Design a protein around this ligand. Structure first.
Ligand code: HEM
Ligand code: HEM
Ligand SMILES: C[C@H](O)[C@H](O)[C@H]1CNc2nc(N)[nH]c(=O)c2N1
Ligand SMILES: C[C@H](O)[C@H](O)[C@H]1CNc2nc(N)[nH]c(=O)c2N1
Ligand SMILES: NC(=[NH2+])NCCC[C@H](N)C(=O)O
Ligand SMILES: NC(=[NH2+])NCCC[C@H](N)C(=O)O
Ligand SMILES: [Zn+2]
Lengths: 420, 420
């Protein structure tokens, strides 16, 4: 009733009950009289530049996580359970923090993905390769750990999901941070004509890189150098071995003139600017990767007005009346581009998933999560594809959104906080 | 500020400050721990049945509306204002209700559209023809009023926005209801051999009509009979003069086989099942109409799996690779289809707007409203088109959704509560 929230699919009339939401702790930004559900960053964890968890705040968080952990392995309240609780309990009193066991790290990492409401690929949550890198101490050690990750996940094209976790944060002792937004991403340059070469989204970062010595090739698809920071020290540039950055040349299965557009994209989507949170611990560096859903590249990266914005030129090549928006020429070109993207990746044998199947699998994931967990936090706004929304099952799916921990949060850009 | 909610557009990086949300008092259905912004009927102030308001509940509401109404005209705290307040207050305790002047009714109708968070066409809000049918007493009277609306509104294909407001709710006389979801819509028949002929969304209503004496043509696009109810009396059937129902045969500007798909739609979209609420008064019968956005018919009405579901047939004809969804045949079919729809209308001089022009307009509207009004409640989930969402400006725009009064609300189906 008042607690048994319901979610129904208006296409298949199936109604599911959500109880998991009750275990929620954090706030969504939505109040009783207003809904912020479309606000990108409610700032309810963009982790401002201030203090951190207190010895007090930290244990309860640990207790909850540890309790979660033992229920899952079917050892709730067991001596082993009580034991690690006092152990962690003591560890914090003395050290003002603690360390997670390998079993606890893998679990929490897989669950920060399971609770990522904006992710449509969470049906893969249980298959994640965790790379404990907490022993790292330098920018060179970081680069080695990263290269190993990029190579493991790219797997010659047969992508694999994986995440690398570097040393948890401390306090005024400083921390680790990958300054890139993603391990692999093209550069962006501002032309004299006010125009912009390459990826407009990475313009400021690229200037940081070139400003730190990087020799920019000044091309359309220039892979950026890694700008790793360790222990709270100045970041150090590091170019990724080219044979390790898999790329796909985009071509259409009908338009021979497609290749002529000079389009290409990278195979591995690895987000690296987020913060993994487990048992109260903040992991400022935890690059993770999986594989692309066509539209990410095709619709968003290529056609976004702010990104490459290739719709116009692609329309011309098709000979479409771009005079009236009523022709739906932007729409027509858009479907062609994304057909090209899935075509290439598939031809080059690189892993990728189209929005139709991706969204369908997510519906099964949802049916699973309700069945075995009693819920599944989902951000409708993010979960629905940025093209052909209506024809995907998730458009008619009603989703409940709440914040569960372990989780992935946004955090400030290191160059708006790093002194010197 | 710390109470001046700021919304941003992640394409132009334009940030607007909303102070208007402060004037809302009603529930959204969300809390700090949960967001139900993707829930269709977030049961949080829909429109309770049984009895109705009360002297206690009514005056404050009426007061809020009037102070608001007199501020619009710039007479707050004037003689007309003060005197008007007391007349109402007086008339309420005596008659246990009150009537709205003709000026206050037009202001309420218009502003209930202005506050419709799920409407993208709101730039027209001020341009509205209000038809006062508060003198109506019988179904035959209701039909005459409806007929006059359809004609004024249709205007030979040069559509005009209008609304017919019937008598408000009382207690015992009883509601005036239009049992039809939309003034003009096609029937749906579920054949014994599983199939559904015509619109599957109208199968339930069609069965009521047939049960009330309607003789069914039993076809694919049979315009349904009006089923009207006056003063709480049993509803009665009324056919709408064919010459009053403007229709449009759908054809494609390049594909001549489209003609043979056998499609046509009505040019006038008139919602008639919502409840208009003004100054505490509830108008159960208030059909309203404007003009269509291409996608409503092209994506939703024609392509939804639970409606006319015509993607397959169109694809085969186009002969797309329907073997694997990575060919995006569904995306390709959906575009041509919507091109055909916008084509057919514009050719038959029937008013219609494409999702590109609409969203571009809702944006300028939002900005103007933030300027003059201080905000604009909007529902991202409904405002973004069901196709090519990201290439439309609204997708990259943040929207604050909240409840303002006057407003249009959902109300139970008349057949699930009408006694005898
Ligand atoms: C099976 C492969 C995967 C697919 C198909 C997938 C797909 C997606 C999609 C479409 C988005 C939208 C991104 C955007 O629009 O910017 C997304 C976001 C996200 N995914 Fe997944 N995902 C996968 C694997 C992963 C992995 C391995 C993790 C972490 C362990 C993860 C965590 C998330 C998070 C945190 C977001 C939020 C992005 C943001 O806030 O900018 N995903 N994913
Ligand atoms: C000028 C032409 C108009 C356009 C192009 C426009 C467009 C739209 C669209 C695209 C929807 C979505 C409906 C759906 O997805 O099922 C909608 C919904 C809505 N519009 Fe407008 N609108 C127009 C006129 C009006 C008028 C005259 C009113 C009332 C005075 C109005 C009130 C609303 C409301 C209350 C909804 C919510 C529908 C619901 O909750 O089911 N609109 N409109
Ligand atoms: C303003 C709005 O929240 C923003 O544009 C959102 C909408 N939905 C999205 N959905 C996904 N998957 N990715 C995005 O970047 C966005 N952007
Ligand atoms: C479940 C979900 O809220 C529902 O399918 C919504 C999504 N957005 C929509 N947007 C519009 N304009 N119309 C709709 O009917 C819907 N349906
Ligand atoms: N499938 C993923 N894990 N994607 C992560 C984000 C990738 C980003 N949206 C891009 O397309 O560049
Ligand atoms: N443009 C409008 N006023 N539309 C009102 C709703 C029409 C409805 N979505 C339909 O396609 O039948
Ligand atoms: Zn919300």
């Amino acid at each position: 009733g008042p607690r048994f929230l319901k979610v129904k699919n208006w296409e298949t009339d199936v109604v599911l009950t959500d109880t998991l939401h009750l275990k929620s702790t954090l706030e969504t930004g939505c109040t009783e009289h207003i809904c912020m559900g479309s606000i990108m960053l409610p700032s309810q964890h963009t982790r401002k530049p201030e203090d951190v968890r207190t010895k007090d705040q930290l244990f309860p968080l640990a207790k909850e996580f540890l309790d979660q952990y033992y229920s899952s392995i079917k050892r709730f309240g067991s001596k082993a359970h009580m034991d690690r609780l006092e152990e962690v309990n003591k560890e914090i009193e003395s050290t003002s923090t603690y360390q997670l066991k390998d079993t606890e790290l893998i679990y929490g990492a897989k669950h920060a993905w399971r609770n990522a409401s904006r992710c449509v690929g969470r049906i893969q949550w249980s298959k994640l390769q965790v790379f404990d890198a907490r022993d790292c101490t330098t920018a060179h050690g970081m680069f080695n750990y990263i290269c190993n990750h990029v190579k493991y996940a790219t797997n010659k094209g047969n992508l694999r999901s994986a995440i690398t976790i570097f040393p948890q944060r401390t306090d005024g002792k400083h921390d680790f941070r990958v300054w890139n937004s993603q391990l692999i991403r093209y550069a962006g340059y501002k032309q004299p004509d006010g125009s912009t070469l390459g990826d407009p989204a990475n313009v400021q970062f690229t200037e940081i890189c070139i400003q730190q010595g990087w020799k920019a090739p000044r091309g359309r698809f220039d892979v950026l150098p890694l700008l790793l920071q360790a222990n709270g020290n100045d970041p150090e540039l590091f170019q990724i071995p080219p044979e390790l950055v898999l790329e796909v040349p985009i071509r259409h299965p009908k338009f021979d003139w497609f290749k002529d557009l000079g389009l290409k994209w990278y195979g591995l989507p690895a987000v690296s600017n987020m913060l993994l949170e487990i048992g109260g611990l903040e992991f400022s560096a935890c690059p993770f990767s999986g594989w692309y859903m066509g539209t990410e590249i095709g619709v968003r990266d290529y056609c976004d007005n702010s990104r490459y914005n290739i719709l116009e030129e692609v329309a011309k090549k098709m000979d479409l009346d771009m005079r009236k928006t009523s022709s739906l020429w932007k729409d027509q070109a858009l479907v062609e581009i994304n057909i090209a993207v899935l075509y290439s990746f598939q031809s080059d044998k690189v892993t990728i998933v189209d929005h139709h199947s991706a969204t369908e699998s997510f519906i099964k994931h949802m049916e699973n999560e309700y069945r075995c967990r009693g819920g599944c936090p989902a951000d409708w706004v993010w979960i629905v594809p940025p093209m052909s929304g209506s024809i995907t099952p998730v458009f008619h799916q009603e989703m409940l959104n709440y914040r569960l921990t372990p989780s992935f949060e946004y955090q400030p850009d290191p160059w708006n906080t790093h002194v010197w």
